[PDB]
Structure 1
């Protein structure tokens, strides 16, 4: 799954706390030609990440985005969240398979290359505006392992910073139209790449709809047992008498956000053991 969120100034605390969560390679990581250009590679330094969120690109540069209207919100970035199918999360995190985690990381990286290809900006010459395709991004990727309900949930926040290097060498805000309008497509890339990676490791796949898949030897009941957030969303539709098969975007987001109950930081080593006990109870055979 690929979901997206335009990030504003009021999200500065949420975005920096995407780093990096000591849990269970490297949990946080830079990607992009923009990033490479700025000398940014390997692990995301969280202090440098905050500066970049604020438009402070540094190294002898003006603060970006001073042309933002007072009546509008400052955009700090674009968050692309890649979430693996539940069976994949289960093999990766309950059974413990570093190869599956790697396969997820690669699917994300390759999808983000296609997102990057679609990076754009504007330039104005004499009141006439032109859209350029820049092809470069600065991205911080932060891998995470659990859902709101403490379920195994392999996902990566790819925070695309709101900056790109234009044709003239100038750094400017990202015109996000091609990435944002291509989310459905980019999600198919993630799925296709992940599936290819898992098949390369000898897993058999079972197919859903709209391109979704799961590992063949984990079934619906077993997946459902580890999908508490899904159950909460289903109950919400039932309570509102809504039909799960035909809901608006606005009603989807309502069910999603308002069905959230607040949970509390838990012993992470004790959590795996519970996952394993649960998988045993659900009869899951991890090969």
Structure 2
């Protein structure tokens, strides 16, 4: 699954709480960023402080509009993949997901764009470079195992004239469904190299063949919450407005509390026994 969200200045706490960490992007390399994401630097870049002999970015933002700190792309593995990675414990599966993300983001980077204005005349440019902070996470809001990576694309890109400007995001934002398919294709290919058999689900989605739908359902509490929020509002899961799909996804939430990580995984393992899961 690939979902996206435009991150605004009011998200500067939450977007820094993303901080298991990796920089990616030709933009990042050119700034000398590679390896683990230093959080102070991440906060600086969120604020548009690219530093190293450059003016603070984005000052031409209207006060009536919100300023944009970035674009969050969230890659989420199928549940059976999450199970094998996080319950059984498999670094190869984690690695396979990391590769799928990195290769998809290369295709996101290819689509990075900017504007330039030459004497009242605006042209759109394909810059092909991004600065991206990747943060891998492991649980859902209902504390189910859930392998997922937040790829925070910072709102910046280097134009042809070598100048740092805000990202025009259209080409990435309108290709979410395509990049989603790249992630699946890459993950599936990587999982097949590791010897796994796959089961296909109408969309390009798949799961590991040795884990069945009932076993998936046992570990998908957030899905049960969404499915119920439609059944109560009388709404049908086939056709619903973007205002409604966002409603069910945000309203149906309950609240949670600082989970004992070592104790959580033991719960997962026991649940997986109850469900009868053979991690082979």
TM-score range with shorter-chain normalisation? Answer: over 0.9
Does the residue aligned with 1:14 lie in a helix, a strand or coil?
Answer: coil
Deviations 1:167-214 (A, max 9, x none): 000000000000000000000000000000000000000011111000
Deviation at 1:103, TM superposition (A): 0.2
Deviation at 1:88, TM superposition (A): 0.1
Deviations 1:142-171 (A, max 9, x none): 000000000000000000000000000000
CA distance in 2 between counterparts of 1:7 and 1:242 reads 29
Deviations 1:36-55 (A, max 9, x none): 00000000000000000000
Deviation at 1:254, TM superposition (A): 0.4
CA distance in 2 between counterparts of 1:245 and 1:55 reads 41
Deviations 1:74-133 (A, max 9, x none): 000000000000000000000000000000000000000000000000000001001000
CA distance in 1 between counterparts of 2:200 and 2:243 reads 28
Moved more, 247-256 or 119-128: 247-256
Gaps of 5+ in 1: 20-26
CA distance in 2 between counterparts of 1:247 and 1:160 reads 29
Gaps of 5+ in 2: none
| CA-based RMSD | 0.4
Deviations 1:8-31 (A, max 9, x none): 000000000000xxxxxxx00000
CA distance in 1 between counterparts of 2:143 and 2:133 reads 24
CA distance in 1 between counterparts of 2:238 and 2:196 reads 30
Deviation at 1:249, TM superposition (A): 1.8
CA distance in 1 between counterparts of 2:252 and 2:63 reads 34
1:227-246 mapped onto 2 (5 Å cutoff): 227-246=220-239
Does the residue aligned with 2:73 lie in a helix, a strand or coil?
Answer: strand
1:4 corresponds in structure 2 to 4
TM-score w.r.t. structure 2 length? 1.00
CA distance in 2 between counterparts of 1:234 and 1:223 reads 15
